[PDB]
Amino acid sequence: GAPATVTEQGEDITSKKDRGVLKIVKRVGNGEETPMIGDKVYVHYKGKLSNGKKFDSSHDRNEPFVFSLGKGQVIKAWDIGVATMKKGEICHLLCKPEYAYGSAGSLPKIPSNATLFFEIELLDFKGE
Numbered sequence: 001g002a003p004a005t006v007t008e009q010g011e012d013i014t015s016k017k018d019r020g021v022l023k024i025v026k027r028v029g030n031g032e033e034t035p036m037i038g039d040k041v042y043v044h045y046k047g048k049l050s051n052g053k054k055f056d057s058s059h060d061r062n063e064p065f066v067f068s069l070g071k072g073q074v075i076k077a078w079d080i081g082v083a084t085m086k087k088g089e090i091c092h093l094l095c096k097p098e099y100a101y102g103s104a105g106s107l108p109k110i111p112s113n114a115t116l117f118f119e120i121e122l123l124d125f126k127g128e
């Protein structure tokens, strides 16, 4: 399925080239521009654990998730992955725990040492 495919066929987007975040572009976005550090970014996403369970979805909330890019307000994989995206792009990200929640995990649903799968849509970005 999609998690296996990004695991086996994804592109390493890390600056360390440590395989910690792998990406596949699913829907090509618009233009060439990617967001700027500090921009307000608006995303829709769904996240799955490696046991197949969905642990989060903004679609199910009927509102996007908003954060300031490159500030550590989200897991490292999202700061580095969203920075690669164009407006309107949809990608898959396969994130090792060192770029996610590490040994701590995150209650209620994310265990220790978890590799995570996300589908992310970059809806918009704006400098404030």
Ligand SMILES: NC(=O)c1cccnc1
Pocket (backbone or CB within 6 Å): 056, 065, 073, 074, 075, 078
């Ligand atoms: N910390 C995070 O990366 C995050 C992203 C979306 C929802 N909750 C947490």
Ligand SMILES: NC(=O)c1cccnc1
Pocket (backbone or CB within 6 Å): 034, 080, 083, 084
């Ligand atoms: N974060 C990146 O890899 C990147 C590269 C070029 C332009 N925008 C983002």
Ligand SMILES: [Cl-]
Pocket (backbone or CB within 6 Å): 001, 002, 003
């Ligand atoms: Cl799938």
Ligand code: NA
Pocket (backbone or CB within 6 Å): 002, 005
């Ligand atoms: Na595929």
Ligand code: NA
Pocket (backbone or CB within 6 Å): 025, 084, 085, 086, 089
């Ligand atoms: Na891109």
